[PDB]
Enzyme design. Structure first.
Site, PDB file in Angstrom:
ATOM      1  N   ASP A 104      22.952   6.801   3.095  1.00  0.00           N
ATOM      2  CA  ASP A 104      24.215   7.769   3.643  1.00  0.00           C
ATOM      3  C   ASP A 104      25.315   7.783   2.475  1.00  0.00           C
ATOM      4  O   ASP A 104      26.260   7.720   2.922  1.00  0.00           O
ATOM      5  CB  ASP A 104      24.518   7.327   4.757  1.00  0.00           C
ATOM      6  CG  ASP A 104      23.659   7.177   5.865  1.00  0.00           C
ATOM      7  OD1 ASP A 104      22.642   7.963   5.838  1.00  0.00           O
ATOM      8  OD2 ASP A 104      23.528   6.078   6.642  1.00  0.00           O
ATOM      9  N   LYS A 113      28.203   9.244   0.234  1.00  0.00           N
ATOM     10  CA  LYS A 113      28.877  10.313   0.141  1.00  0.00           C
ATOM     11  C   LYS A 113      30.022  10.007  -0.244  1.00  0.00           C
ATOM     12  O   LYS A 113      30.432   8.880  -0.322  1.00  0.00           O
ATOM     13  CB  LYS A 113      28.659  11.007   1.538  1.00  0.00           C
ATOM     14  CG  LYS A 113      29.055  10.302   2.717  1.00  0.00           C
ATOM     15  CD  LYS A 113      28.538  10.613   4.157  1.00  0.00           C
ATOM     16  CE  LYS A 113      29.319  10.007   5.292  1.00  0.00           C
ATOM     17  NZ  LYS A 113      28.695   8.490   4.952  1.00  0.00           N
ATOM     18  N   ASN A 120      32.141   7.121   1.255  1.00  0.00           N
ATOM     19  CA  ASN A 120      31.772   5.875   0.778  1.00  0.00           C
ATOM     20  C   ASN A 120      32.091   5.334  -0.578  1.00  0.00           C
ATOM     21  O   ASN A 120      31.729   4.320  -0.938  1.00  0.00           O
ATOM     22  CB  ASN A 120      30.192   5.820   0.706  1.00  0.00           C
ATOM     23  CG  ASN A 120      29.655   5.824   2.465  1.00  0.00           C
ATOM     24  OD1 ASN A 120      30.289   4.975   3.339  1.00  0.00           O
ATOM     25  ND2 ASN A 120      28.797   6.624   2.779  1.00  0.00           N
ATOM     26  N   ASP A 168      29.276   0.382   2.657  1.00  0.00           N
ATOM     27  CA  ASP A 168      28.095   0.695   3.405  1.00  0.00           C
ATOM     28  C   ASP A 168      26.698   0.494   2.870  1.00  0.00           C
ATOM     29  O   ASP A 168      25.691   0.904   3.847  1.00  0.00           O
ATOM     30  CB  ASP A 168      28.243   2.073   4.109  1.00  0.00           C
ATOM     31  CG  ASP A 168      29.323   2.178   5.353  1.00  0.00           C
ATOM     32  OD1 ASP A 168      29.856   1.020   5.865  1.00  0.00           O
ATOM     33  OD2 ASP A 168      29.750   3.196   5.713  1.00  0.00           O
ATOM     34  N   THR A 185      28.228  15.013   6.655  1.00  0.00           N
ATOM     35  CA  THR A 185      26.955  14.142   6.252  1.00  0.00           C
ATOM     36  C   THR A 185      25.667  14.949   5.673  1.00  0.00           C
ATOM     37  O   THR A 185      25.165  14.611   4.835  1.00  0.00           O
ATOM     38  CB  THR A 185      26.237  13.249   7.395  1.00  0.00           C
ATOM     39  OG1 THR A 185      25.802  14.228   8.258  1.00  0.00           O
ATOM     40  CG2 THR A 185      27.455  12.165   7.783  1.00  0.00           C
TER      41      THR A 185
HETATM   42  C1  LIG Z   1      27.320  -5.019   5.162  1.00  0.00           C
HETATM   43  C2  LIG Z   1      28.723  -4.288   4.943  1.00  0.00           C
HETATM   44  O1  LIG Z   1      29.819  -4.964   5.619  1.00  0.00           O
HETATM   45  C3  LIG Z   1      30.977  -4.354   5.631  1.00  0.00           C
HETATM   46  C4  LIG Z   1      32.102  -4.956   5.638  1.00  0.00           C
HETATM   47  C5  LIG Z   1      33.457  -4.339   5.567  1.00  0.00           C
HETATM   48  C6  LIG Z   1      33.449  -3.004   5.367  1.00  0.00           C
HETATM   49  C7  LIG Z   1      34.466  -2.508   5.176  1.00  0.00           C
HETATM   50  C8  LIG Z   1      34.658  -0.758   4.870  1.00  0.00           C
HETATM   51  C9  LIG Z   1      36.032  -0.122   4.956  1.00  0.00           C
HETATM   52  N1  LIG Z   1      36.423   0.877   5.685  1.00  0.00           N
HETATM   53  N2  LIG Z   1      37.464   1.141   5.204  1.00  0.00           N
HETATM   54  C10 LIG Z   1      38.275   2.166   6.063  1.00  0.00           C
HETATM   55  C11 LIG Z   1      37.998   3.500   5.139  1.00  0.00           C
HETATM   56  C12 LIG Z   1      37.759   2.487   7.289  1.00  0.00           C
HETATM   57  C13 LIG Z   1      37.956   0.128   4.246  1.00  0.00           C
HETATM   58  N3  LIG Z   1      39.059   0.292   3.719  1.00  0.00           N
HETATM   59  C14 LIG Z   1      39.544  -0.586   2.775  1.00  0.00           C
HETATM   60  N4  LIG Z   1      38.666  -1.516   2.640  1.00  0.00           N
HETATM   61  C15 LIG Z   1      37.455  -1.769   3.204  1.00  0.00           C
HETATM   62  N5  LIG Z   1      36.700  -2.527   2.804  1.00  0.00           N
HETATM   63  C16 LIG Z   1      37.032  -0.580   4.033  1.00  0.00           C
HETATM   64  C17 LIG Z   1      33.624  -0.361   5.083  1.00  0.00           C
HETATM   65  C18 LIG Z   1      32.218  -0.966   5.371  1.00  0.00           C
HETATM   66  C19 LIG Z   1      32.282  -2.267   5.132  1.00  0.00           C
HETATM   67  C20 LIG Z   1      30.996  -2.944   5.572  1.00  0.00           C
END
Ligand SMILES: CCOc1ccc2cc(-c3nn(C(C)C)c4ncnc(N)c34)ccc2c1
Length: 452
Positions: free
Chosen positions: A130, A132, A135, A151, A170
């Site tokens: 996914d 994009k 991400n 992600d 998406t």
């Molecule tokens: C196995 C993967 O485990 C994780 C653990 C933490 C995560 C944090 C973010 C994240 N989102 N956002 C806003 C855009 C909603 C974030 N903003 C800043 N930092 C971040 N790190 C994130 C995304 C995915 C993640 C996946």
């Protein structure tokens, strides 16, 4: 090991894929982190638990400067808590749209980081699926900042929600083989190729009025460099794109081989020796593109929050009603806090006080709980209303104050609001709308589109 024993929530970072992301602080060390919380109830699981736990432990051991660092994992009866490194630079595209100049060198630097992160994850047999723009996060809000991919790993173990507010935007990036069911790591190369195409032209290669139209183009897999702004682009850039957007995945170039491509090698030199014509049409298109995506997303979030606040308004009223044993409609600070927590079960002290500030500044006595509910729920929807207005204003790049019917068609198509439905809603708001709406009318439309 309980999550709450170690971490306290500080503030919400957003609702990304598979659930909420909360900024949290280690209770002992002060270390800030971004925790993705996945509801086992709301989100189904694909694999057995053993497989999920193994992949998670692997991810903790992997380190790459373009992949979000995973620190820890927790689980209780209802949730998974994924503790990652917090990045403060925002989404790549939200930075790009603020820039005055953008060249092939800038695009190449961006894509080289994405390809580096992907290559490393693929070496460890982890597929994103996914990928994009959403991400691609930045460590700081500047063109000099490193990109961190978020992600990786989740798609293999968790089912994405079919809620349109979540699946908006998406369709542009998903590989054709993912649509049909048989896919591998090459799908990430395809998604990256779509992103590269967009960086260099400002337009998706597979475009359309709505989800199904876009998916239909992706499945056929045909695209062109017909647009005028492709004349400003090197043949080398286009060649990489053709290899990355090759339909049959075994014939499609690998992430590793894509790093070795002439274009990447040539245009990511620290010394810019080549021509650097700013891709001005691409920037304007990408602004239009981002603006459209963010407005449609904001529109759906606004409607979602309006429905949510309708429920909570009824629930909170009932809660206070039970507490109102006097039947006089008035409660004190203490009781208002208990009821607010009672709804939460279905910081709190301070939120109540902000409401009481408006209601009874002096705080001389008791509070009409009906007056409280309104202000409480009203200001809780502020973020969504303000974000909607900001998105409207940003989309309205010439500051006309209006959005046209053609633009409405694009925004609602992306949002999966039926053509005849929104037109009908428009007619009811303004019989003489003259094929355009201001912000207030747009907002009125959204309200009627969610039963208000
Ligand atoms: C196995 C993967 O485990 C994780 C653990 C933490 C995560 C944090 C973010 C994240 N989102 N956002 C806003 C855009 C909603 C974030 N903003 C800043 N930092 C971040 N790190 C994130 C995304 C995915 C993640 C996946």
């Amino acid at each position: 090991a309980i999550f709450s024993d170690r971490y306290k929530g500080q503030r919400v970072l957003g609702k990304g894929s598979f659930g909420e992301v909360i900024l949290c602080k280690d209770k002992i060390t002060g270390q800030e982190c971004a925790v993705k919380v996945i509801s086992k109830r709301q989100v189904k699981q694909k694999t057995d638990k053993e497989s999920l736990l193994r992949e998670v432990q692997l991810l903790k051991q992997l380190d790459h400067p373009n992949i979000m660092k995973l620190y820890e994992f927790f689980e209780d009866k209802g949730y998974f808590y994924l503790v990652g490194e917090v990045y403060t630079g925002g989404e790549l595209f939200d930075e790009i749209i603020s820039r005055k100049r953008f060249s092939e060198v800038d695009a190449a630097r961006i894509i080289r980081q994405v390809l580096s992160g992907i290559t490393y994850m693929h070496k460890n047999k982890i597929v994103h699926r996914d990928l994009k723009p959403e991400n691609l996060l930045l460590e700081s809000k500047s063109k000099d900042a490193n990109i961190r991919i978020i992600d990786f790993g989740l798609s293999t173990h968790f089912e994405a929600s079919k809620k349109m507010k979540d699946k908006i935007g998406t369709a542009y990036y998903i590989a054709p083989e993912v649509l049909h069911g048989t896919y591998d790591e090459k799908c990430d190369v395809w998604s990256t190729g779509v992103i590269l195409y967009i960086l260099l032209s400002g337009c998706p290669p597979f475009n359309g009025a709505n989800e199904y139209d876009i998916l239909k183009k992706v499945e056929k897999g045909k695209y062109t460099f017909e647009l005028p702004q492709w004349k400003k682009v090197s043949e080398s850039a286009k060649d990489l794109i053709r290899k990355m957007l090759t339909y049959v995945p075994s014939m499609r170039i690998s992430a590793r081989d894509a790093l070795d491509h002439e274009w990447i090698q040539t245009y990511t030199k620290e010394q810019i020796s080549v021509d650097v014509p700013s891709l001005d049409n691409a920037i304007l298109n990408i602004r239009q593109f981002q603006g459209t995506q963010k407005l449609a997303q904001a529109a759906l979030l606004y409607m979602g929050s309006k429905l949510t606040s309708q429920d909570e308004t009824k629930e909170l009223t009932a809660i206070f009603h039970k507490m109102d044993k006097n039947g006089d409609g008035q409660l004190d600070r203490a009781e208002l806090i208990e009821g607010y927590k009672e709804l939460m079960r279905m910081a709190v002290e301070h939120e109540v006080d902000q409401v009481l500030d408006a209601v009874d500044f002096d705080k001389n006595g008791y509070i009409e709980y009906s007056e409280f509910v309104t202000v409480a729920m009203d200001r809780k929807t502020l973020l969504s209303r303000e974000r909607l207005e900001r998105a409207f204003r940003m989309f309205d790049s010439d500051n006309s104050g209006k959005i046209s019917s053609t633009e409405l068609a694009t925004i609602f198509g992306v949002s999966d609001v039926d053509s005849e439905t929104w037109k009908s809603v428009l007619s009811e708001v303004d019989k003489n709308n003259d094929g355009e709406v201001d912000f207030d009318e747009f907002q009125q439309m959204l309200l009627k589109l969610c039963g208000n």
